Design a protein around this ligand. Sequence first.
Ligand SMILES: Nc1ncnc2c1ncn2[C@@H]1O[C@H](COP(=O)(O)OP(=O)(O)OP(O)(O)=S)[C@@H](O)[C@H]1O
Ligand SMILES: Nc1ncnc2c1ncn2[C@@H]1O[C@H](COP(=O)(O)OP(=O)(O)OP(O)(O)=S)[C@@H](O)[C@H]1O
Ligand SMILES: Nc1ncnc2c1ncn2[C@@H]1O[C@H](COP(=O)(O)OP(=O)(O)OP(O)(O)=S)[C@@H](O)[C@H]1O
Ligand SMILES: Nc1ncnc2c1ncn2[C@@H]1O[C@H](COP(=O)(O)OP(=O)(O)OP(O)(O)=S)[C@@H](O)[C@H]1O
Ligand SMILES: [Mg+2]
Ligand SMILES: [Mg+2]
Ligand SMILES: [Mg+2]
Ligand SMILES: [Zn+2]
Ligand SMILES: [Zn+2]
Lengths: 48, 536, 629
Amino acid sequence: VCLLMGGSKKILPDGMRLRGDINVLLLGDPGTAKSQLLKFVEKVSPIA
Amino acid sequence: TERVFQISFFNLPTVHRIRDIRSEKIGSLLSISGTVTRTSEVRPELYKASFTCDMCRAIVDNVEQSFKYTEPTFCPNPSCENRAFWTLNVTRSRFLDWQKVRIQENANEIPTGSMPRTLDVILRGDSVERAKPGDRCKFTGVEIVVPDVTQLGLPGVKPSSTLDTRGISKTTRSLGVRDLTYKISFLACHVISINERDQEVFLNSLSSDEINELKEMVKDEHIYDKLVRSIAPAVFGHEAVKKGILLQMLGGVHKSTVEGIKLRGDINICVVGDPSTSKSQFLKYVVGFAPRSVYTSGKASSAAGLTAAVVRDEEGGDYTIEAGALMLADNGICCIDEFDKMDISDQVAIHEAMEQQTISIAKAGIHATLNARTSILAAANPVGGRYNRKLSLRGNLNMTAPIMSRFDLFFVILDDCNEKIDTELASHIVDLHMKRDEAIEPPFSAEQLRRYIKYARTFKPILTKEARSYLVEKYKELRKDDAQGFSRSSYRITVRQLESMIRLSEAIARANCVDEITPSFIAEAYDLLRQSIIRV
Amino acid sequence: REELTLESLSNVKANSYSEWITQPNVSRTIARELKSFLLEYTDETGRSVYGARIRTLGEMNSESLEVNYRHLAESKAILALFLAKCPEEMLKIFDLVAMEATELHYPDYARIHSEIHVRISDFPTIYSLRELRESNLSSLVRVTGVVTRRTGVFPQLKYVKFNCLKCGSILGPFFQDSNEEIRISFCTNCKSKGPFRVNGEKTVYRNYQRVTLQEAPGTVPPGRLPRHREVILLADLVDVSKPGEEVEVTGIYKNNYDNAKNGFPVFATIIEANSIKRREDVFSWTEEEEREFRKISRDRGIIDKIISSMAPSIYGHRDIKTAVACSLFGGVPKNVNGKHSIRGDINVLLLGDPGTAKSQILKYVEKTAHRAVFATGQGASAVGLTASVRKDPITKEWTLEGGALVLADKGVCLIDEFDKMNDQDRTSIHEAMEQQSISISKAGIVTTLQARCSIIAAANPNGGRYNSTLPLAQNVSLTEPILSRFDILCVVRDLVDEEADERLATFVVDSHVRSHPENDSPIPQELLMKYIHYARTKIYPKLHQMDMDKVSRVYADLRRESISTGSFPITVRHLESILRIAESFAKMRLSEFVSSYDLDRAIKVVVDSFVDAQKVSVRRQLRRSFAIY
Ligand SMILES: Nc1ncnc2c1ncn2[C@@H]1O[C@H](COP(=O)(O)OP(=O)(O)OP(O)(O)=S)[C@@H](O)[C@H]1O
Ligand SMILES: Nc1ncnc2c1ncn2[C@@H]1O[C@H](COP(=O)(O)OP(=O)(O)OP(O)(O)=S)[C@@H](O)[C@H]1O
Ligand SMILES: Nc1ncnc2c1ncn2[C@@H]1O[C@H](COP(=O)(O)OP(=O)(O)OP(O)(O)=S)[C@@H](O)[C@H]1O
Ligand SMILES: Nc1ncnc2c1ncn2[C@@H]1O[C@H](COP(=O)(O)OP(=O)(O)OP(O)(O)=S)[C@@H](O)[C@H]1O
Ligand SMILES: [Mg+2]
Ligand SMILES: [Mg+2]
Ligand SMILES: [Mg+2]
Ligand SMILES: [Zn+2]
Ligand SMILES: [Zn+2]
């Protein structure tokens, strides 16, 4: 949910862009639904 | 209408090479020889054209087309007085059969450092399809010239023709300039080479004295042993390899199932071993004795040279299939020396022909399925340049497993520092150098041995009922011998060995010239196969 | 004089048969006499075969009349000889004759089809493509061969209406044929001879196709290369002979007229096909056949009958055949709410030593499966396993080739040599097994093709022989991610038993004996193939909560004996493979719900596959842990 929302981007006066998107890693045992939650995120995101 | 007659001269006093062809002999009868590489499909050639005039819609026939498209000059009706406007109507025309053969120089006729020359021979009439790729044929006919526009840009003063502009009565741009550049071609009226599956038709057309000697050879008791001793007389002491070569040159029978598995009866042999063990002297012997045999090397071959290629002679010209080594050796033997040196892709290409005995080329708009019914006699060297006795046959050979499976026999030849054997090999090598053919003493000459093999290839061996059970028992014995625990066979046994045994038994039955496979033949095949496996 | 009879037809007053037939005095005689031949000829039993053929033609709105050559030859020998002599002037009179005969029975038929095409069949003289010479030109030949290429379907001018650019006038229909294009120089309204353009909108067209017919490689004499010809299919035969099909083409052998490349006036030849037929739909069923399927399904032990039916020249390998049947019938895909997706395909791996018949169980699946695509890790590259946008170098146009997994979108993909594959093929197969789709962004094309295929793979162990002491993961080149996607793993090793080896050799020598060139309870193949197609198309089984309890417990047991061993993880993927194989077991019985016995069989298959993929030390789960199942 947080990754789909993501944080707010900042464009500093320096041109220093601060990122708002969230990156989430799932290290896990095989058969733990990691791919199925990736496929669902692909389906539910507007662009994915 | 009228029968066209073909006068076919032959038996000329002399035979010319491709490089002996010179421009003095244009339009003259003469004989050449060459190895056929490519043959055209028979095509219709306009011989007596019929023409319709646009003014007078009459029909002028029997317009002889000598060598090129030629419209008539005078109309049949006197009123028209037209000469330049005509139409060819194809149904009302007459045609001949035309095939264009391509012939290369024979391997023994190429000069030092030069490359083989190629010539386009034109077969016409009843001589079409009398030459097929791979065969060395001699042609009798006319040395002709055909237009060759590719001579543009060549050095020298190329000839040209201009219309004579005198006696023409100008009034005060009519060029008519043509290029007289030609190339030498050949028009053959006679082809002779320099379907046998039925036995009786083969024996019927064969000289009586040869029947005398063939039936004497069949009447002989140790005919198998004499045949083996007559295989590769120059090589000394490798008798298992000679047995295998003889059986390969005889072959089994091709059997097709109900659904079309199409079991193949061609014995494939691989010869591996230590350096200088005569492995390439057996491949040398096979090519030059076995009919339709093609010899090639691992590093001098490509996937498009072994199997058929899609080539183009002229830019802006169409594409053609020139026949590969696996097709020039069709119904024969392909002797591939240094199989290990050959690239992986070429090995996969040869695998495509070992599985289905067919090659599929789908390149450039040609989607042809060619058949390559060939036995592959391969010579290979183990990795590291020397056989490892304490390593498996697979570990010794870089040859891929899909290729290795289709080889029925693996003859591993190892040399040893045996006092007597070395003294006797060396006597043979030096006597083979001192004398030329007196040092070779085979029980049968190549002529009658080839005749016997040609006769024995016509049989369909059948195995009797006890042969089936003993084949089962021998397969069981091979399986029991394998995976024993201490035998450590070089390559392990499966149902491919059982099929190898059946076809080897059929080859042995052909060697003995009997239509029934005696169980002793299965025993001999079992021994020959079993002795091939080397314990680690 | 101006009208002849059948007896007087033989005497030819012209130089050749073409002028004889073109002569109106002979043309009307031939037309009348063929009109008589269509009407009178009847079979020995009494059936007027051409009567029934006309009724069938009228009742199916077809424009092809299947005229035989026995009947013409026996009834009117001189006309059959004329047809075999000049089949261009004939089949033009007789097409009109057939049109008249079908208009008599079916009046007002010209409004439907302009003309009836006649398909001469059972021609006696069968030629070979290498035997065709100039003497066969302009005549009717009957060759046989395999189709190797087809060039689309193109319209060809048949009834040309030409627009006058001076008036704007549309000149009437002018019949154009396969000889050459026609042209008009005379107007009517303004009598202009200037530019006259074909009007595409008002012109009538016919289908046209070129098929390359190449000699069957088996029939070619040794040392000779197969010969090919170009067969022209016109307006009714288009798209009936796929490449690789062995057909018998009856047609007219003629010259393609268009000489200086050869130095000789040499013409190419074509065969304008009259009738094309396969010499020897398949998966379609009738109502009677559907009833037969539904009745044979009700018999008990049908699953074992189907299992034994598969691969009837492959000895033993009964677990392999069970897995092959399960994959052939397959499960059923499921979407919860468009949010969770589960594949309904059973991927089966065959890990075996050399000479274990793995390739033969792949060719049999290609035999029996509808929409089955065969590919290899290395070798004959009929299909590439990878979707690519490739520019064809001869036709100048790009093509988006879906991979072997795309071509068999709803069927089976059979991969041989799955142990050895390129990284590209490995990635393609892995991502089409994970997502059931093929994503491609090449040459401006960005699309996700569908690859909802069931994968049957054949592999060789890593080294040459299976090692029971080592686990399956390190006995073969491919690694954890790809092996997990395989629902069933059939591990077969080359055993060392006296009895098995004896009986396999008895089977092979019997097959060799049967196959000699001299005379020296399984469901039938075609019935089974139609049965499998019907079951896949019509049967979508389900389960019910009544069978939840046992399955859950089994899953738990599988887990606990697996971590105690610790060698192989059995995850939720194994429960979902049990479910899929249960759906397949119900499918082969034509059932709509999954019975508990189907669940038991699926559990048995899954546990057997998982157990046989373990080590000998880990194999205890078979003897005393999972012996209950
Ligand atoms: N907690 C769970 N709830 C529901 N289904 C699950 C659960 N865990 C696994 N599955 C199912 O298990 C099957 C395989 O799980 P995957 O999503 O492929 O696991 P994974 O951990 O991503 O595997 P890898 O690491 O990619 S090999 C899917 O069909 C999931 O629906
Ligand atoms: N387009 C093609 N499709 C299939 N096979 C072909 C094709 N072109 C050539 N071949 C093969 O090549 C053989 C040679 O026949 P042709 O191609 O007609 O003759 P060719 O050697 O190209 O001679 P010319 O110079 O064209 S008369 C054929 O019999 C086929 O086996
Ligand atoms: N048993 C033998 N009989 C006759 N000549 C032999 C024999 N063994 C070796 N030779 C001779 O030794 C040489 C062997 O050369 P090859 O026949 O090319 O050997 P090879 O086994 O192919 O060697 P590699 O594998 O290419 S290093 C030739 O001079 C042979 O005539
Ligand atoms: N159980 C069996 N029943 C019948 N024939 C068999 C059996 N096992 C092996 N064979 C035969 O053994 C040979 C093996 O050929 P394939 O079926 O291609 O084997 P394979 O397992 O694909 O071999 P690799 O691994 O590709 S070298 C064929 O001639 C089969 O007919
Ligand atoms: Mg995953
Ligand atoms: Mg050598
Ligand atoms: Mg295989
Ligand atoms: Zn004229
Ligand atoms: Zn006009």
